[PDB]
Each structure stands twice: as C-alpha cells, then as structure tokens.
Amino acid sequence: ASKEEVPDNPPNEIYATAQQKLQDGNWRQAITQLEALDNRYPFGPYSQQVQLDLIYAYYKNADLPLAQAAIDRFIRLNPTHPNIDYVMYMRGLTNMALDDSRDPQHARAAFSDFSKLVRGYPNSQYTTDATKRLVFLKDRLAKYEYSVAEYYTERGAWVAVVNRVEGMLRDYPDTQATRDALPLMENAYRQMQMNAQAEKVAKIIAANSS
C-alpha cells in the first residue's frame, strides 16, 4: 500500500498480495499492487498475467476507459496469446458496460467483439456466454434499426427505409425485429411504384410466415 509506494519486494511476492486482494474482492487495492508490478517489472515473469488481472480489476472497479486501454494494448502486443479469447470477451463486456451508461455505438462495438470471439475461437470457455449475449445484442440493435425504419416510413423517406432494412437483413437477420421490418420494406417499394422489388420481399415474408 497505498500508491506505488508498495514495499520493495520481488515480483512473485507483490503478485501474491495482488492475488489475495483479488480474491477478497478488493479491487482498488489489487490495482495498486498490479500497477506497481506493471511499472517496476514491465517484463516480469507474470507481466502478461498482470495485464489480464489489471483488465479484470479495472473493470470490476468500473474504470472502463482504463480497462479498454489495457485490452487494446494487449491485443496489439499479443495477438496470439493463449488467453486472447478471455481478452476479447472482456472487450465485449466493457462495451456493454459502457452502453449501459439513443444511437448505441457501444452495443455495436460489443456485438462486433463477441462475433469475433465466437467465430474465431469456437472452442473457448467463453463462447457459450458470449453467444447468449450476442442474442441479447442482436435484438436490441435490431430494435433500434427498426425504429429508425419506422421513423422514415412516417416521413415517407422510402429509400431511407429500404436502406435501413437492407442493413438489418445483413447485420441482424434471424431476428424478430428484422422480420417485422420486412413489411416496411415492402411498403416502401410499393410507394416508389417498384412492384417487382415489392413482390420479391413479399415472397420472403410469406415464406417465414409458415
């Protein structure tokens, strides 16, 4: 304690204290220990593990900018580290944490993160809870898009409607909100007198309506 005037002990000892403080749930004191490590022994024997720990502690203490800072640093220096999957997962969580504090760029980021994890490391411990979250994100992101499509319908901006829904079909297919947006697409086409295009959409609606 209590600042990076932590006693001059060798690394394994200070790490041991940090482990303790982490298990006690004492995030603020853990961060003191781990920064003393990061600053004194930047190439230490636990130097990578310290960063993984600092990503955790910063997050639990709600120092989110600090967490993403340490996440991105890490991903850049260690693109193939055996715990890269843990890091991606924490990137997801941190962007969800930020989205939680209407355009949701932070939820978009999270979605992009959990997608990389899931597609890139299908065998990770984290894949399971990451995909459960993607499901949550897909739906909220799609609901936001749909409400923009709903706005443009209101204003008769037919082409804007089509463009929105095309994005929905690409990024968030297999979603309820996307299925509810399809009729907005069909309508926007009929309004532009483009009935051929409208019939094609009507095909898709009919199909997932059985």
What domains sit in the chain, N to C, each tagged with a CATH number? Answer: 1-210 (1.25.40.10)
Token readout for 80 is 């193939």
Token readout for 35 is 């920064």
Resolution in A: 2.6
Q: Dihedrals φ, ψ of 10, to 5°?
A: -70, 165
Q: Say which residues have a Cβ less than 8 Å from residue 80's Cβ, sequence separation at least 6.
A: none
Ranges of H-type helices in the chain: 11-23, 27-40, 47-60, 64-77, 84-99, 105-120, 127-154, 158-171, 176-191, 195-207
How was this structure obtained? X-ray
Q: Dihedrals φ, ψ of 92, to 5°?
A: -55, -55
Alpha carbon distance 47, 191 (integer Å): 62
Are the beta carbons of 86 and 126 closer than 8 angstroms?
yes
Burial class (CB in 10 A: 0-12, 13-18, 19+), 183: middle
Alpha carbon distance 88, 100 (integer Å): 19
Orientation angle between helical segments 176-191 and 127-154, nearest 10 degrees: 30
In the chain, the amino acid numbered 195 is N
Are the beta carbons of 120 and 87 closer than 8 angstroms?
no
